[PDB]
From Swiss-Prot:
Annotated catalysed reactions: Hydrolysis of keratin, and of other proteins with subtilisin-like specificity. Hydrolyzes peptide amides
Protein encoded by which gene: PROK
Binding site for Ca(2+) 2: 16, 260
Active site: 39 (charge relay system), 69 (charge relay system), 224 (charge relay system)
Family affiliation: Belongs to the peptidase S8 family.
Cofactor detail note: Binds 2 calcium ions per subunit.
Function: Hydrolyzes keratin at aromatic and hydrophobic residues.
Domain (Peptidase S8) ranges: 7-279
Source organism (scientific name): Parengyodontium album
Portion of the full sequence shown: 106 to 384 of 384
Record's keyword annotation contains Calcium: yes
Protein name in UniProt: Proteinase K
Length: 279
C-alpha cells in the first residue's frame, strides 16, 4: 500500500534515498499490535486516530493532553495520515504534565504500569512502548525501561536533544532498549540529536508533521519525534511477524539503511530505520 504526499519521515523509512514523498507500507499497517505512548497524553478524539487511541493512565488531574507533544508522537506512531503503523492500537500514558515535564518517580511508575497493564489488553502481534522524553542520567529510570523491555515490551526511547553523547541521559543510556536518534530530510544527523555508542538507530526527527491537540496538525522536531517513527515501525514489523518485541531493536538496526546519514560522529552507528517494503 502507498500513501502519496506523505510526511517526509514516512516516505524516508520506506526509501533507500531522501527527498521522496510516498510512504510504501504493507497493508496490515500494524493491525493487532499496541503502542503505549508514554508522554503528555493523547487527544484520542482526534479524527486522525479513528478511535484507535485511548488514554489508559494519567498521573495528573486530567488525562487531557493539554500540551500537544504526546498527541504528536501518538500521531507519528499510528495516525491515519501521519503515522507509520496506520492500524495499530494507541494507549496513552500521561506521565508528563501539560508543560511536557515530569518527575522521575512519575516516569518510572508509568513504565511499571505499562509492564503490567499490557496483560489487560489484546495485542496479539505484540506490545510496543514509545518514550519520547528523558532527563539526566538515572539508574532508576534506566532500570525501569529495562524492566519494561524485559517484560516483553519493545521499548523505544529518545536519545535526547542535547547534541552530546547520550550516555549521560536516561532512559537513553539503558543498553537494553532501543535508543533513537534524529536525522533530517537531507539524511544529516539532526543538529540537536544526541549520539554515542548507546544509540541503536536513527529516525526522521526534524520538521515532523503529525497530529496536534485541538484536532489540528503541527510540525516540530526532536529525537522525541524520531522515537515514534521507530516505535511505529517495530509495531508494524511485529504485525508482519518479521521480528519480536525482544529482537525488534536489533532487527530494525540489522535492516536499516546503512551509511546514508552524514555528520554521524565516530563511534555512533550510521543506521536509518527502514521497513524494506517491496511491492
Amino acid at each position: 500500500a502507498a500513501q502519496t504526499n506523505a510526511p517526509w519521515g514516512l516516505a524516508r523509512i520506506s526509501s533507500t534515498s531522501p527527498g521522496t514523498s510516498t510512504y510504501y507500507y504493507d497493508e496490515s499497517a500494524g493491525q493487532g499490535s499496541c503502542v503505549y505512548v508514554i508522554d503528555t497524553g493523547i487527544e484520542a478524539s482526534h479524527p486522525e486516530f479513528e478511535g484507535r487511541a485511548q488514554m489508559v493512565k494519567t498521573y495528573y488531574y486530567s488525562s487531557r493532553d493539554g500540551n500537544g507533544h504526546g498527541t504528536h508522537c501518538a500521531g507519528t506512531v499510528g495516525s491515519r495520515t501521519y503515522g507509520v503503523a496506520k492500524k495499530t492500537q494507541l494507549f496513552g500514558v500521561k506521565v508528563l504534565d501539560d508543560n511536557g515535564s515530569g518527575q522521575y518517580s512519575t516516569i518510572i511508575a508509568g513504565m511499571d504500569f505499562v509492564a503490567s497493564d499490557k496483560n489487560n489488553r489484546n495485542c496479539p502481534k505484540g506490545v510496543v512502548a514509545s518514550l519520547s522524553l528523558g532527563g539526566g542520567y538515572s539508574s532508576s529510570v534506566n532500570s525501569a525501561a529495562a524492566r519494561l523491555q524485559s517484560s516483553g515490551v519493545m521499548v523505544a526511547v529518545a536519545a535526547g536533544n542535547n547534541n552530546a553523547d547520550a550516555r549521560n541521559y536516561s532512559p537513553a543510556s539503558e543498553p537494553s532498549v532501543c535508543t533513537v536518534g534524529a536525522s533530517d530530510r537531507y539524511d544529516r544527523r539532526s543538529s540537536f540529536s544526541n549520539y554515542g555508542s548507546v544509540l541503536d538507530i536513527f529516525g526522521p526527527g526534524t520538521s515532523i508533521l503529525s497530529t496536534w491537540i485541538g484536532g489540528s496538525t503541527r510540525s516540530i522536531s526532536g529525537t522525541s519525534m524520531a522515537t515514534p517513527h521507530v516505535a511505529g515501525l517495530a509495531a508494524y514489523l511485529m504485525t508482519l511477524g518479521k521480528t519480536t518485541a525482544a529482537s525488534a531493536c536489533r532487527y530494525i538496526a540489522d535492516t536499516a539503511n546503512k551509511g546514508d546519514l552524514s555528520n554521524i560522529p565516530f563511534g555512533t552507528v550510521n543506521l536509518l530505520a527502514y521497513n524494506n517494503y517491496q511491492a
